[PDB]
Amino acid sequence: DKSIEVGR
Amino acid sequence: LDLHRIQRDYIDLVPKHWHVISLSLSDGGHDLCITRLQAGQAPFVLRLPLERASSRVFDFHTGRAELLEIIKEINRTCHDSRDMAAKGEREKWWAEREALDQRLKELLMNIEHVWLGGFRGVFSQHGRRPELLEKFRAMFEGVLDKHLPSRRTKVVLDGNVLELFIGLGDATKSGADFDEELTDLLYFVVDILQFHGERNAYDEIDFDSMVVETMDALMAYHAEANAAPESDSHAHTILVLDKQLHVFPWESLPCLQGLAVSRIPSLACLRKLLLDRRRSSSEDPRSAGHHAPLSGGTYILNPSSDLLSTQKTFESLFSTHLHSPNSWTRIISRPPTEPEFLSALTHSPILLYFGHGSGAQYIRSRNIRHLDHCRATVLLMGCSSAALPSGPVWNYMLAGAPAVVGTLWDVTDRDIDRFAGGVLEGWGVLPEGCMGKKAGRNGLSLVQAVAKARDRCRFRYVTAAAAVVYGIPVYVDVDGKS
Numbered sequence: 001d002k003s004i005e006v007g008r
Numbered sequence: 009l010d011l012h013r014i015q016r017d018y019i020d021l022v023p024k025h026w027h028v029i030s031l032s033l034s035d036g037g038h039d040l041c042i043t044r045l046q047a048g049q050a051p052f053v054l055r056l057p058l059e060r061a062s063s064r065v066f067d068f069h070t071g072r073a074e075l076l077e078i079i080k081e082i083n084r085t086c087h088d089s090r091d092m093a094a095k096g097e098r099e100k101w102w103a104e105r106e107a108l109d110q111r112l113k114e115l116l117m118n119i120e121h122v123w124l125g126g127f128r129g130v131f132s133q134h135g136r137r138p139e140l141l142e143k144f145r146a147m148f149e150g151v152l153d154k155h156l157p158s159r160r161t162k163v164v165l166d167g168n169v170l171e172l173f174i175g176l177g178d179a180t181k182s183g184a185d186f187d188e189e190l191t192d193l194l195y196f197v198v199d200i201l202q203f204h205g206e207r208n209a210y211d212e213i214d215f216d217s218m219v220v221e222t223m224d225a226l227m228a229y230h231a232e233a234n235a236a237p238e239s240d241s242h243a244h245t246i247l248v249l250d251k252q253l254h255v256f257p258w259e260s261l262p263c264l265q266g267l268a269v270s271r272i273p274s275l276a277c278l279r280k281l282l283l284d285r286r287r288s289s290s291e292d293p294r295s296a297g298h299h300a301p302l303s304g305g306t307y308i309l310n311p312s313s314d315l316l317s318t319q320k321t322f323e324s325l326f327s328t329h330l331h332s333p334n335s336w337t338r339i340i341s342r343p344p345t346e347p348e349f350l351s352a353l354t355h356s357p358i359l360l361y362f363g364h365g366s367g368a369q370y371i372r373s374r375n376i377r378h379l380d381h382c383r384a385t386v387l388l389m390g391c392s393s394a395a396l397p398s399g400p401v402w403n404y405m406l407a408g409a410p411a412v413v414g415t416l417w418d419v420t421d422r423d424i425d426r427f428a429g430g431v432l433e434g435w436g437v438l439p440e441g442c443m444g445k446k447a448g449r450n451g452l453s454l455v456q457a458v459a460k461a462r463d464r465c466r467f468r469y470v471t472a473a474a475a476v477v478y479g480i481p482v483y484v485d486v487d488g489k490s
Contacts, residue, residue, distance in 0.1 A: 004093045004101045005420030006315065007086035008364065008391030 011043075011051060018275040019045045021282060023296035025243050028278070029131065031258070032250035037068040040123055044130055052130055052168050058123050064195070065122055071115070075255060078112050079417045082470055086391065086418035105470050112257075112469040120261050126192030128263045129175025133243035136171070140229055145170055147225035152197070154221070157212045163204040169197065179226035180234065186226070190219045242293035244455055244481050245269045246278060251397055257416060260473035265462065268455040270477045273397075273405050281410055281480045284381075289488035297453050297481035298410040300385050301488035302437065305330060306337040306352035307360040311370065313341045318362055318421050321429070321443075328445055329438055346371050352384060353407070357490060358437065359384040362428065366393040366400040366414065373403045382407035383490070385454065385482045389428045391418040394476055401478050411454050411479030423471040430461030436484040453481035 019028060027046040034041060034055065044052035059065050066074075085105050092101050120128060148170065153159050172193055176186050194215055198208055245267055247258060259269045272278045281298070288299040307326055310319040323340060330336040337352060344352075349371040352359050361367045366388050376382070386409050388394065394401045394414025404412045413431065415424070429443035434457030439446035443464075452460065455477055462472035 001095070001098055002102065004089045004098055005422045006317065007089050008389075008415070008419040008421065008424060 011053075014275065015045065015051065018279050020047045021279060022047050022246075023244075023282075023293075024048055025135075025241050025293055026246060026296065027133075027243075028246045028248060028272075028275070030248040031253050033068065033252060037252075040068075042127070042130055050166065050168060052172075054127060054130060056123065056125075056127055060192075060195075061122060061125070066118065071119060071123070072252070072255070074115055075112075078108060078115065079255070082108050082112075083392075083418040085470075086420050089420065105467060109467045109470040112473065116257070116261050116469070116473075119256075120263055121188075124261070124263070126176070126186075126189035126196070127172060128189070129172045129177075129193075131245065131264055131267065132171075132175030132177070133241070133245060133267055134175060135238050135241055135243075137233055140233055141167060141170055141174065143232075144174065144225055144229045147228065148173070148222060151218050151221045151225070155214055155218050156198075156201075156206075156208055158201070158206050158208050161206070163201045163206045165197065165200065169200065172196075173222065173226060174229060176226070178230045178234070179223060180230045186223055187219050190222055191215055194218050194222070240293070242296070242453070242456075242481075243268065244296075244453065246480070247271045248273075248275065254397060255416065257469075257473040257476070259459070259476060260462070260469065265468075266459065268453060268459050268481070270411065270455045270479060270481070272478065272480075273402065277405050278480070280408065284408060284410075285480070286485075288483065288485050294451075294453075294483055297483045298385070299483050299485040299488065300357035300410070301485045301490050302357075303334050303488070304336065304356055304490055305334070305358035305360070305437075306339070306356040306384070307362070308339045308344050308349075308352075308367070309360075309362050310341050311339065311343045311363045311367075315363065315421055318425055321422075321425050322362065325438060325442055329442070344370050346375065350375060350379065353379060353382050353386070353409075354384075355490075356384045358484075359386045360389070360428075360432075360437075361387060361393075362389045362425075365390045368400055373400065376400075376403045376407050379407045382409040385410050385479075386412045387428065387431070388412060388414040389424055391415065394478065405478055409479060411477055411482045413454070413458060413475065413477045415474040416476060417474050419471050419474055423465050423467060424475075426464040426466070427461050427472055427475055430464035431457045433457075434460045436486060449484075449486065451483065453483055455481045 024047045030043040032041045040056045042054040285298045331338050395416050401412050432438040434452045436449040436451050439449050458477050465472040
């Protein structure tokens with residue numbers, strides 16, 4: 001449920 | 009002769025507590041060729057048939073194809089993120105990346121187990137203990153005398169062969185099991201004897217008994233070695249990789265994860281960087297590294313404005329610890345101009361790039377070449393900043409950057425930020441405990457800091473294994489000036 005991380 | 013010239017003209021100028029390891033493939037890709045070079049030492053030369061276990065398993069093509077498939081899927085997860093961002097798609101996204109982390113982990117485990125096998129000790133950074141090695145020599149020669157049919161003239165083994173046994177690590181530790189590794193090395197010893205004319209048939213050799221007795225000799229070595237432990241050697245390993253091998257995250261092989269390991273394009277490049285080392289402002293092993301002043305660095309943070317979490321994580325810390333007290337230049341939430349970027353490379357001892365990619369969208373590669381000299385040690389915290397030879401890292405090395413940290417494939421913001429924060433704390437750019445106002449700082453080399461910082465990521469393989477450093481060890485000179 002941690003927010004999806006944003007791509008590099 | 010050429011290995012003699014390489015040793016004399018390049019390696020013997022390298023700090024003696026470092027070693028250089030060259031990895032390449034034989035013509036058919038059938039063998040992993042490993043050459044370990046070290047100042048004042050005879051070269052280790054190994055040629056390891058990848059499938060040697062079969063006649064006693066996966067080939068290079070199989071291994072590389074598996075790696076590239078994993079990387080492709082990892083990259084896909086980094087950019088499908090935005091679309092997937094929801095509340096239960098989160099669960100699937102994290103599950104997919106966890107599964108990839110396990111897949112890459114298993115691949116690296118299999119490479120270490122099958123390809124390297126008992127030769128993983130070639131990577132050991134343990135300090136030489138001449139008197140203990142000769143004690144081991146006597147015991148090991150006793151094992152050979154007892155078990156080889158040929159000994160019922162004797163070839164005398166080089167010290168470096170024996171060091172491979174020592175390099176397996178502390179045999180007295182709980183959980184230690186060297187049986188398969190020792191078997192692999194005993195075949196090697198029999199093959200060396202064979203080559204020099206002392207011949208034996210494998211079928212007439214009780215390898216299992218030799219394993220037990222050799223392990224007992226190693227327990228004797230390490231029991232005595234542990235009584236006078238290595239305190240702080242500042243050992244570093246530099247990898248020279250052939251073109252097809254750069255994509256492998258060698259540093260994240262299980263047996264290498266704890267080690268300070270960097271990469272270098274060539275021995276010529278290594279030699280150049282060494283001759284341009286800056287001394288600290290201060291028998292001291294740290295003196296072997298380049299020393300970069302803390303003062304006068306540059307950070308480029310969220311240049312495309314969309315990386316708000318990354319900006320949030322570092323902006324205040326950087327203002328407090330770098331911009332305010334240490335005269336750093338800051339470029340935040342706007343693109344750097346090419347002149348700004350080039351000026352930072354020219355004047356800053358440290359450049360932090362926290363954005364997308366390598367920053368090539370802001371500075372042309374050929375202008376990095378025009379630089380009379382690249383002063384900056386560069387951290388390129390973005391996607392595939394050290395990937396896929398020609399590329400940004402190649403040009404920084406050409407320009408004489410002492411070191412460049414980059415990624416072999418795509419990464420996501422929060423996890424690479426965990427890594428980056430760890431590097432800065434370990435390196436001493438930020439005070440210890442910043443990421444978790446602080447004062448008091450560590451002093452690891454950049455390479456040591458990178459190796460340690462891989463621990464900070466949620467995914468050691470999906471994220472941290474991407475992170476590599478090209479160049480030589482760099483220490484922060486806290487009180488130094490340019």
